[PDB]
Ligand binder design. Structure first.
Ligand SMILES: Nc1ncnc2c1ncn2[C@@H]1O[C@H](COP(=O)(O)OP(=O)(O)NP(=O)(O)O)[C@@H](O)[C@H]1O
Ligand SMILES: Nc1ncnc2c1ncn2[C@@H]1O[C@H](COP(=O)(O)OP(=O)(O)NP(=O)(O)O)[C@@H](O)[C@H]1O
Ligand SMILES: OC[C@H]1O[C@](O)(CO)[C@@H](O)[C@@H]1O
Lengths: 296, 301
């Protein structure tokens, strides 16, 4: 039971690096271009792998040349893809990403290809004895709340020394997803969500939202160059300053780098304070680099 | 496979992967949005022209630069989907196969474009030296790296000097961007296409103005051609007689991207079949006008 599993989206990121964001109805040349395997859960596996944690990914992919690229990338990272929910309806999602090389800003135009989401049916088919931690990227809530319950069930049946740790990401300001707050030992909530609920800082968001998590859970809110905060059962607010690189050149996947790093640190036994900090340390480092290579 | 002597039309130029996203509204910097639709397309002038030539029923080949990879794979498969011979591609060990990002605003039609990077080397004159020409009856060059392309043209001229009239390779050139370096290309080719956009930048306000004002720059005996959107197109040859065809407006205008390339390929095709310049202008306007009412190149027949 020593593999981390991330459940969520995997998409092909077609990326252009520009030195200024283009005004509407204008035309500008890009400095360079590349393809990356992206999606939150997928980006997190990249990071876990680079950190040395055996991990595996689970999500929908449609057979094709794109998927072939993605799988190859997964494999080069040593990510287990065996639990992938292969399909026959829909395309694999992709996006156009513009990365502003002058400040690391990233603009994402996303194509969700109707590809049907992973289901409780698919999940129930998974040998949970393989995993020390399961992270779930909040997408199809009603169908994921089910997967969560299945995980609780498995836990109710296990020595505390052998329970599967669970984390949840709530990233889009979307009603259906809020039911997810109520599950998992660790809950990640985004600045975008927090702002959409009227909160103007990580600390205010944590106070405002801790009521929604389940007893014993740690709530976590990262906030870009403000670093990140966390709040546990004891009611003590925890904070970490960011580690901004002198030149921020690419923030695409910083959030996923942070989540992966917190999970890793926690799974390794560290305190929440220490994990917050390691999360920022690794995410800040990634912001100084194009892509993920070399955060290690 | 075996390609019969003097059977193919070659187009030398750019091929690019265009990623096209339709959106409700232009994305603000550092935001994430869902598009209404997104499309991968093969683009580029020489590339577009090859597609049209194939649909017209001509054997045709593309020569341009690519680098091994998944972008080139998509592009090669799309070429072949259109019956284009890719065996003359100049494969590169350095650089990125061109790809461009285009964002189309659905609620005002605007197009915001991030152009491909500059990393890939253009086809060089030494690259072109290695090509056996006997295969081709017509070679068309999209003006890009002009100093190198001038050498390619001189090489074609040398080949022709030694041939009987019935095995001379016909040559055409396109000058599509207003850049001074490209202008030396006017001096090569039996047929020179100049775009309205270049004409305008030089200060000409019509096709008639452009042809009379630029004809001086072409080599003796050459035909100079200029299409002008809804005004159709003109041509001027050595006999000094300005030739013209009106446009053939379609029931409604759906997509004019690549109309110029459709026009170019169609004129080349017609002339390659031995039609008169006047017949070719007309045919070019008919095919391109038809194309303006269709999305893409399907059904231009
Ligand atoms: N400009 C920055 N400087 C330093 N650290 C940063 C910066 N932006 C993000 N980080 C770090 O990454 C964490 C998450 O930031 P966040 O703004 O949620 O990332 P994100 O860019 O939204 N990820 P993504 O959705 O792929 O773009 C922050 O808590 C910091 O640790
Ligand atoms: N709006 C139109 N209606 C009819 N025919 C058109 C139209 N636009 C272009 N064409 C035809 O396409 C030929 C080439 O026109 P050209 O101006 O080079 O097109 P383009 O620059 O590729 N696209 P656009 O600038 O939007 O017209 C013209 O000579 C016409 O035959
Ligand atoms: O939401 C989809 C997008 O979000 C990211 O995962 C960034 O976290 C990109 O890789 C992907 O295109």
């Amino acid at each position: 039971g020593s593999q981390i599993l991330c459940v969520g989206l995997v998409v092909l990121d077609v990326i252009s690096l520009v030195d200024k964001y283009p005004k509407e109805d204008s035309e500008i040349r890009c400095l360079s271009q590349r393809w990356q395997r992206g999606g939150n859960a997928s980006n997190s596996c990249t990071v876990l792998s680079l950190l040395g944690a055996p991990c595996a990914f689970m999500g929908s992919m449609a057979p094709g040349h794109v998927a072939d690229f993605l799988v190859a990338d997964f494999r080069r990272r040593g990510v287990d893809v065996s639990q992938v929910a292969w399909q026959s309806k829909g395309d694999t999602p992709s996006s156009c990403c513009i990365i502003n090389n002058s400040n690391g800003n990233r603009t994402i135009v996303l194509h969700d290809t109707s590809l049907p989401d992973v289901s409780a049916t698919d999940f129930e088919k998974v040998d949970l004895t393989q995993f020390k931690w399961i992270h779930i990227e909040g997408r199809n809530a009603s169908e994921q709340v089910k997967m969560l319950q299945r995980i609780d069930a498995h836990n109710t049946r296990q020595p505390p020394e052998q329970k599967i740790r669970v984390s949840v990401e709530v990233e889009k300001p979307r009603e259906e997803l809020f039911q997810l707050f109520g599950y998992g030992d660790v809950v990640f909530v985004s600045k975008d969500v927090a702002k959409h609920l009227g909160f103007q800082s990580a600390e205010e968001a944590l106070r405002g939202l801790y009521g929604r998590v389940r007893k014993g859970a740690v709530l976590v809110c990262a906030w870009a160059e403000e670093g990140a905060d966390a709040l546990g059962p004891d009611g003590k607010l925890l904070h970490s300053d960011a580690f901004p690189p002198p030149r921020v050149v690419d923030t695409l996947g910083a959030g996923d780098t942070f989540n992966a790093s917190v999970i890793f640190s926690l799974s390794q036994g560290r305190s929440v304070q220490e994990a917050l900090r390691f999360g920022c340390q690794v995410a800040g480092k990634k912001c100084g680099l194009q892509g993920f290579d070399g955060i290690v």
